[PDB]
Amino acid sequence: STRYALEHLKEGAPLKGLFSIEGLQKAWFDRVKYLDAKLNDCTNEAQQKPLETLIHENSKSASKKHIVNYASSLYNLKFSMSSLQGCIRTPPEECPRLGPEALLQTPDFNRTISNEPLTTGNERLQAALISSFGSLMEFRTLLINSNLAISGDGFTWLVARRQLDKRAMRNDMPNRDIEYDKLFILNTYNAGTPFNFSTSGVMNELNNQYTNMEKQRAKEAGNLEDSEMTAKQAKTKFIYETQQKGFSGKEVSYIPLLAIDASPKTWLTDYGVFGKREYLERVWDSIEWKIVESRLPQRTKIQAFNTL
Amino acid sequence: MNTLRCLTQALSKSGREAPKLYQKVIFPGLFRE
Amino acid sequence: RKFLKFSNDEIPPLPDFSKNPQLFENYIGILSHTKFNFRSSSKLNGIVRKMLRHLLHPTNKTTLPLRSAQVYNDSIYFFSEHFDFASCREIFAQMKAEGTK
Amino acid sequence: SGKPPVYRLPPLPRLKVKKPIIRQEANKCLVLMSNLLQCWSSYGHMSPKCAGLVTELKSCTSESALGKRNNVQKSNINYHAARLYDRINGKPHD
Amino acid sequence: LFYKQHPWELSRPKILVENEIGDENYDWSHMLQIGRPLDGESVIQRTMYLIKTKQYGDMVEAYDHARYEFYALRMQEETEQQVALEEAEMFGSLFGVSAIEHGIQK
Amino acid sequence: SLPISRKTFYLCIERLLNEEQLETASKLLDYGFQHLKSNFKLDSEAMNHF
Amino acid sequence: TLAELLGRSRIAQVANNHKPLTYTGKKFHPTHQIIETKPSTLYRQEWGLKSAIPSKIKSRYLVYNDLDTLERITTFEPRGGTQWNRLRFQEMGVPIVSNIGRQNPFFKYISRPEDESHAKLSLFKEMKGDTDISPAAMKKRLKKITALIRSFQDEFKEWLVENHPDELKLNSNKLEDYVVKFLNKKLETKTNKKFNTEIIGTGGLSYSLPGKLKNSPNGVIQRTVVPGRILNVVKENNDNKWLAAIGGFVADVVFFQSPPSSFNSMGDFIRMKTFLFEILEASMEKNGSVSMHARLLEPQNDKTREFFNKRPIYKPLTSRRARRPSVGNIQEANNLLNIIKGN
Amino acid sequence: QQTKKIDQSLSKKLPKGTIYDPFDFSMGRIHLDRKYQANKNSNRNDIMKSGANPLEFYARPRILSRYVTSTGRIQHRDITGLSAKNQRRLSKAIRRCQAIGLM
Asked: What's an example Gene Ontology biological process for this entry (chain H)?
């Protein structure tokens, strides 16, 4: 757990208005301990490697999929919990538990706003958010709605689209590497990874191999291809590629900037079941925008601030 | 002599409404091969 | 669409259109506004007029609908430029006869 | 004059269409005869090109000239009117 | 007024067969009520609750407040629909027919 | 207050040369060349006029 | 009591409507409320209306205008498919972008206080509410407004003479500007918040925010491909785009620099076949219509590199370098006048 | 292939942006709209039904000619659609115009 600790959180302490002592323990420390235990139990002799590098290098293989499972879960929890700092509201242990009336209670995202980055002085982030989602109210409503909608263990991310320049994967290009185009919001489930550059095309390649092997079976059995065999497969392949056709050059990747956890393990301890909305609202109030503004990469100066 | 006044007032009461046009160079030699 | 002012060479070769017809429109479009100084074939006694008329005469063997309005537009432009009101009149008449709006 | 006025009939002994017109189907055999004779007129008597049309008419008038009869169609509007007139006429309550 | 401000709200079907109209206990402090859908009638009843309990003045204020709550609730609902569909397709649910292809068949 | 065009420019120079101001015409052509770079000016018919 | 109940009854919830059930003009949004029945009630011919719908209506949905009529029949139509059009649009899942118009209606803002835009024209519009009959309807509305403003005459008098007598003694247009401002605030007063019928937002077509991504097992989705049809074999006359049927909506379709030879082969019968379309954008119009742009997808796999072809969509306005100078004749005219003088 | 060109009499041209249903493609839609073909453009653009006095136009043969046949006869009210008062005033104006000789 030493390799995955953080300054903000401490052992045997509650967070400001977000988690009790028991809540913080069972949410973060138990999870990280279990994940570390099982990940090291599995074949991960190259533990010294970073988690991101491990995920990128090891993937697209069912034989080595539990490694990706556990590493991705650990990274997701790390990033999602990093941004939290604390809120002004009363601690949950003293706050009364909610009941069935919570569902009937009407949200106020349509009429209120709080915890704006401009207050902390991230005018850059504010401009990006306004240009991307229209308004902070749009952004807040989208985040909370999506995270409350996702039922199973998952996360909601503020991603930034990075358009890969036309190249043969030549590394070490400073001052031009991290350039984003637009900000988006994404959902991931279980072990989903919001990068998309090591993820796009998996099903397409599986389908290609499957159709090739079916063709071998047909040839060795002396069969003849059919109308569907030549048209339906072609159409499926075409739609797959076109859907995953973001750009000619290595498509487009996503840079994480923020993540919120929707796993019931995170919030049922101190909010029951009816309190998922309250947990999300307090999470919103408990974002330190300095971290996200630091993580926000440069905009695509090329042609965009060039305007020529 | 009144043509200038009339066209100026017509401009005043009529919006510019710059249109959108699409053009690029073309050369006959493209289809020689 | 932008076109070339004129040329100082022979007429470009005619490409095939049975398999690849879409080049006919571009070829005629550029030719209509191309003025040739080498062969001087764009005048009343030149070969350009006969070259385009031998293709516009039967409207292909069977694939009559291969053509569009732009070819007639450019032909009328050419005849206009060469001061043939009668020619432009006939192109308009047969264009309307073919039914294309 | 927002919309055209609506005209009401008085109490009527019966609602009935005297002769109902039916969408009669065109008969290809007479169509063939007509087009063959028109072809003769257009391209001279006994036009060699329309020998095919001559054969089609041959086939369609080999047996009974009219062709064949499957069913005779006429409308049921008189029945439906007789059934719904009392309901839809909107007469004053008895 | 509501249905000529939101015509497509007419496209959301409404059942006109009653069921124990005397067994309704609605506190219109909140538009969500158990046993009834989220329709324009909810907006209307919220508006008249606001007027009756005198939290607003003229009717347009209460109607504006009710419609701005309605928008939030509808936003939540549609986002839930899309997210649930994406979850199911993530985890392997398979659909025989979709609306677009049903329309194509017709 | 409408931008100058190539055809407008040949029009104006054709009008000017009727009075035969050689120096003014030369200066006008030079200024039209140095400015209005975006505009597709400097056409051979302009020379033909002279 | 009984009237109080009837007010809340479900029949009362349907707004009064008498628009034609059979309508042939352009249709842009639903005109009637869909009334449905459960299978159990349909088996017993119960729909909730006054009359029992006949037996041959085997559909569970309908629309209607009158509960009963003089002809002892219920004016209804066993129809209702706008629900399906809305659901298909939701499937397409392309959020509506608020072009030109800012400040998405479904959200409250504090920007309205920033109201400085030729308010006199808006006030003229509001006065001329009864736009039906110029000599009668607008005339009587104008007379009502005239009586009101005659009544309000005196207060403006004192307010102006107290505030800006300088504008009075200099007889400037600030006077009329002040008239506009005064009547503006008098219209901000009570009995003026008013009710607006104008179509706000999507009108219930969809409640979506632009910015969220669609995630698929093959990776996050980048482009939406949906089936459609081609209505007209030839693009609209005078226009460079075709019209396509996509999920119940007619969309303006662009071509990838070449119409497929299938168009020439099928001719006017092109509606028979189905094609694939990619929805670039979806937007609204003041008339409530939804204008959506699509691009046809012809698979170029195992095809030519589309050489010997022109560029149809390409801006020649990529001249911000030329934009940098004025090019407004303000100084070019000065230079040309100097030329006229001889320099 | 087969016959490849068809007229506009029986092919519905859907306007852009309009919402549609599958039934619109059927042959029934063409019959329905030919049956309910009502000229509401005339309703919108007619000066007389706007509210103006028909007698005010007695010196406008161009305007009045839109309410007469080719030969010069006046259409019945069932055709014109005007109110009784408007029809009487319009015919009065037309007949006058004829007397003066402008029409």
From this structure: translation
Q: Which two tokens stand for residue G267?
A: 């001719």
Polymer length of chain E: 106
Which of chain C's residues have a Cβ under 8 Å away from the Cβ of H5?
Answer: 65, 99
Q: Which two tokens stand for residue G205?
A: 């077509």
Is the CB of residue D85 less than 8 Å from the CB of residue D75?
Answer: no
Please report residues of B whose CB lies closer than 8 A to that of G313: 22
Subunit partners of chain D (3 or more CB pairs within 8 A): G, H
| Type of residue numbered F6 | R
Q: What angle do CA A144, A149, A152 make, to 5 degrees?
A: 120
- State whether residue G258 sits within 8 Å of chain C by CB: yes
Instruction: Say if residues A13 and A21 touch (Cβ distance below 8 Å).
Output: yes
Residue G33: CB atoms within 10 Å: 23
The total number of residues written for chain D in this structure: 94
Resolution in A: 3.0
> Which of G266, A232, A296 is closest to H6 using CA atoms?
G266
The answer to whether the Cβ–Cβ distance between G9 and E99 falls below 8 Å is no
- Residue D88 forms contact with G (CB below 8 Å): yes
Residues of G in contact with B11 (CB under 8 A): none
Contacts of E89 in chain A (CB under 8 A): none
Q: What is the dihedral of CA C42, C43, C45, C49, to 10 degrees?
A: 50
The token duo for A21 is 């002592």
Among residues G91, G108, G126, G112, the alpha carbon closest in space to that of G279 is found at: G91
Rg (CA), chain D: 25
Residue among G62, G28, G65 nearest G46 (CA) = G62
**Experimental technique used?**
cryo-EM
Which residues 6+ apart lie within 8 Å of C61 measured at CB?
A: none
How do G290-296 and G249-254 pair as beta strands? parallel
Burial class (CB in 10 A: 0-12, 13-18, 19+), E100: buried
* Phi, psi (rounded to 5 degrees) for G63: -135, 160
Q: Do chains B and H touch (3 or more CB pairs under 8 A)?
A: no
Rounded to whole angstroms, how far apart are CA atoms G213 and A253? 13
State yes or no: chains D and B have 3 or more CB pairs below 8 A: no
Which of G71, G55, G63 is CA-nearest to residue G22? G63
A141 DSSP 8-state letter: H
CA separation for the pair H73, G70 (Å, rounded): 39
Interface contact G72, partner D, CB < 8 A: yes
Whole-angstrom distance, CA of residue E106 vs CA of residue A161? 40
How far, in Å, CA of G235 to CA of G155, rounded?
A: 62
* φ/ψ bin of E54: left (φ > 0), alpha (ψ from -120 to 50), beta (otherwise): left
How far CA E58 is from CA of A239, G109, G195, in Å, comes to 55, 20, 11
With an 8 Å CB cutoff and a minimum of 3 pairs, decide whether chains G and E touch.
Answer: yes
What distance in Å separates the CA atoms of residue A92 and residue A18, rounded to the nearest whole number? 7
**C13/G contact by beta carbon, under 8 A:** no
Pick from A184, A199, A238: which is nearest to G211 by CB? A184
Sign of dihedral through CA atoms G319, G320, G326, G328?
A: positive
3 state SS of A233: helix
Q: What is the DSSP letter of H73?
A: P
Nearest residue to A154 (alpha-carbon basis) of A81, A83, A82, A76: A76
Beta bridge partners of G245: G229, G250
Residue the block writes with tokens 């009637």: G32
Residue with tokens 């609306």: E99
Which of chain G's residues have a Cβ under 8 Å away from the Cβ of H16? 236, 243, 250-252, 291
Q: Which residue has the tokens 């757990």?
A: A1
CA-wise closest residue to G95 among G216, G255, G224, G199:
G224
From C1, C23, C66, residue closest to G308, measured CB to CB: C23
Which residues of B fall within a CB distance of 8 Å from G323?
Answer: none
